[PDB]
Design a protein around this ligand. Structure first.
Ligand SMILES: O=C(O)CNC(=O)C(=O)O
Ligand SMILES: [Fe+2]
Length: 331
């Protein structure tokens, strides 16, 4: 067995190895990388996503979300309060203002400590799920807007043609900006590129113990657990590293810096926070190994998760039994 520890592996591909995305994902997994639930990929030194970031100020964040917490410091949910539209330029100014700027601190460990101690007391504003791409049209490798689609992957493995297309999303963050504990829709892979700015800290549970995390979340959020058999789909729940330790939940942490890719693996629960103003780009993807995870993936039918048009066909083909009930939760 490779990576028997499920530790997070960091990859440094050559120019040549960076030329075939699917090949390199398969190579990572041949080394056991998927066992951690997250891997880091450092692009080759000659690679760039694009020339500069000088001209991104006019991008509109149509619906900035203020992330308001309830609970206690290490066990809370957050809700998203919609704010008025702003440009990236305005958002960056707001991130850097006294009220929201990264505090003075020693190192990453000092910031992590301040995050879990103080996060619930503030409500930072983040620009999430903005359809779009910052990759230069001419960047040929690891261009997140040029990956093969999940619809074509499904077709190629199952021989069925389906509607839908998938496209990247941009995320503009600031200090304390928070991504709640979750796996991807249909337990897909994701890949995340940090274009610019301050770091992102990730926490991840190995896929082989995602059920343990679900069990703890049901003990920690009893009210949300009753409302829904798949409530982590709602993406509202936070549980600190200290609470995970106390509860025997295996996990790992890693900090992503600008210029680096993160890959999450099927059914790898992850959560995290941003160190300060940054911009990340992300997309889901599939490989033949995902198919079996997609067939077993849990579904919110609470209403709450309210997903995307593109998911309909995945539930339809991979989970025909679950489809009617899912479809009605969608209304
Ligand atoms: O933009 C972010 O940092 C949030 N991303 C993810 O959860 C992901 O790519 O899986
Ligand atoms: Fe994610």
């Amino acid at each position: 067995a490779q990576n028997p520890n499920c530790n997070i592996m960091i990859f440094h591909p050559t120019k040549e190895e960076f030329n075939d995305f699917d090949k390199y994902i398969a190579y990572m997994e041949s080394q056991g990388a998927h066992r951690a639930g997250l891997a880091k990929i450092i692009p080759p030194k000659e690679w760039k996503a694009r020339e500069t970031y000088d001209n991104i100020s006019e991008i509109l964040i149509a619906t900035p979300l203020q992330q308001v917490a309830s609970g206690r410091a290490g066990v809370f949910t957050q809700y998203h309060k919609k704010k008025k539209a702003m440009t990236v330029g305005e958002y960056r100014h707001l991130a850097n203002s006294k009220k929201y700027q990264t505090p003075p601190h020693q190192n990453f460990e000092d910031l992590e400590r301040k995050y879990w101690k103080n996060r619930i007391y503030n409500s930072p504003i983040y620009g999430a799920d903005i359809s779009g791409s910052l990759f230069d049209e001419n960047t040929k490798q690891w261009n997140l807007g040029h990956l093969g689609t999940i619809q074509d992957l499904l077709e190629k493995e199952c021989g069925v043609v389906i509607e839908g297309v998938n496209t990247p999303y941009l995320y503009f963050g600031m200090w304390k900006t928070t991504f709640a504990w979750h796996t991807e829709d249909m337990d897909l892979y994701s890949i995340n590129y940090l274009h610019l700015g301050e770091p992102k800290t990730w926490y991840v549970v190995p896929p082989e113990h995602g059920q343990r995390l679900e069990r703890l979340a049901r003990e920690l959020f009893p009210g949300s657990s009753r409302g829904c058999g798949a409530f982590l789909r709602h993406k509202v729940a936070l549980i600190s590293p200290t609470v995970l330790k106390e509860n025997g939940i295996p996990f790992n942490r890693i900090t992503q810096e600008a210029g680096e890719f993160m890959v999450t693996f099927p059914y790898g629960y992850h959560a995290g926070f941003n160190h300060g103003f940054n911009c990340a780009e992300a997309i889901n993807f599939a490989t033949p190994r995902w198919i079996d995870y997609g067939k077993m993936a849990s579904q919110c039918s609470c209403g709450e998760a309210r997903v995307t048009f593109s998911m309909d066909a995945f539930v339809r083909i991979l989970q025909p039994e679950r489809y009617d009930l899912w479809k009605r939760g969608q209304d």
